[PDB]
């Protein structure tokens, strides 16, 4: 067979230790899921510095905690705008997820609070900028570089899916590079905790699995399709399906004919054909062997999964850091005033935040 006795025992043991880890992680998650934190700071505790970008349904500002000098990334959500967009439940759910999960590649929620006008999610500041920026700057990542990032997403999805969470917005724009060169996943505004099938048309066009586009329902395997899109985009510099307009992108996705740059390794092409697989009885991450079909694939043969989790692998790119609160790794954005009305808006709808 492919493994002798020692290698087979080692792999078997590693796979059993994942099960043990995930059982404990679920216990810890459910305690926080059932009793969320609330109202752990207020706005005048922070200096507002600069807008870092957007997140689902809001804008993200670099802030400095006045008492400590620590910097954070604060997402500001206008309650009235959220109501108009029909996104009350998704904003509540994002905060509930962020305060309940705990994983080294998931951005942490350090404080949250609300006022008459807005909701505030004060996250860790991840200073190295978006993966999107670095990818567009250098064109494409080498396969080892892409693999280092991909391994972090594989472990993060293994974790989230064990909690019955589907992420549903993987893309380089949402992945931030920290000071050690590791990835932080942001934006849970489209995530859902559900145990089987769901139907919502949501996500980013290039990253949608065919079964999201089509009226049929879908499950967590859409995240493994999206991983295929991400790995392809990281290694090629462009995604496998694109067009001028989303309608035409969707046609290409459900047609599903993937073509590869000639510099892609055979191992990479094999992995991607098994992730970008329209047939759910064949898509990796959706089979009897679960995530192990991905983690044990030849393209990941050099990946030390525990060492990635422990953040002991040397990252391929370390962002430059000028000083505290430096935003040199970010685009500039329009600076929008934070206004707080004298009257409480939408109080009953956002009670749980």
């Amino acid at each position: 067979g492919h493994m002798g006795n020692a290698a087979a025992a080692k792999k078997g043991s590693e796979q059993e230790s994942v099960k043990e880890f995930l059982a404990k992680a679920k216990e810890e998650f459910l305690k926080k899921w059932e009793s969320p934190s609330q109202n752990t700071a207020q706005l005048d505790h922070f200096d507002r510095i600069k807008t870092l970008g957007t997140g689902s349904f809001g804008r993200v500002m670099l802030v400095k905690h006045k008492e400590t000098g620590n910097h954070y990334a604060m997402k500001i959500l206008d309650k009235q705008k959220v109501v108009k967009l029909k996104q009350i439940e998704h904003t509540l759910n994002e905060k509930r997820i962020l305060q309940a999960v705990n994983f080294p590649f998931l951005v942490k929620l350090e404080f949250s609070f609300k006022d008459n006008s807005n909701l505030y999610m004060v996250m860790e500041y991840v200073p190295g900028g978006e993966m999107f920026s670095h990818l567009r700057r250098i064109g494409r990542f080498s396969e080892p570089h892409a693999r280092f990032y991909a391994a972090q997403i594989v472990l993060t999805f293994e974790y989230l899916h064990s909690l019955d969470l589907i992420y549903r917005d993987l893309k380089p724009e949402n992945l931030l590079i920290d000071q050690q060169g590791y990835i932080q996943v942001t934006d849970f505004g489209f995530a859902k905790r559900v145990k089987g099938r769901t139907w919502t048309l949501c996500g980013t066009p290039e990253y949608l699995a065919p079964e999201i586009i089509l009226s049929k329902g879908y499950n967590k395997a859409v995240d493994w399709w999206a991983l295929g899109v991400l790995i392809y985009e990281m290694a090629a510099g462009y995604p496998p399906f694109f067009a001028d307009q989303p309608i035409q992108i969707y046609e290409k996705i459900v047609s599903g004919k993937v073509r590869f740059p000639s510099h892609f390794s055979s191992d990479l092409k094999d992995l991607l054909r098994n992730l970008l697989q329209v047939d759910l009885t064949k898509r990796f991450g959706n089979l009897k062997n679960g995530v192990n079909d991905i983690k044990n694939h030849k393209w990941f043969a050099t990946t030390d999964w525990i060492a990635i989790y422990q953040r002991k692998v040397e990252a391929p790119f370390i962002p430059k850091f000028k000083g505290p609160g430096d935003t040199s790794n970010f685009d500039d954005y329009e600076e929008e005033e934070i206004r707080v009305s004298i009257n409480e808006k939408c109080g009953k709808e956002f009670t749980e935040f």
Binding site: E173, C202, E206
Partner: peptide, 19 residues
């Protein structure tokens, strides 16, 4: 080429989600 088509697509910048 595929890369040239990507540049011509207008979707090389940040991509918004839909809901």
């Amino acid at each position: 080429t595929t890369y040239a088509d990507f540049i011509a697509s207008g979707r090389t910048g940040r991509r918004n989600a839909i809901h």
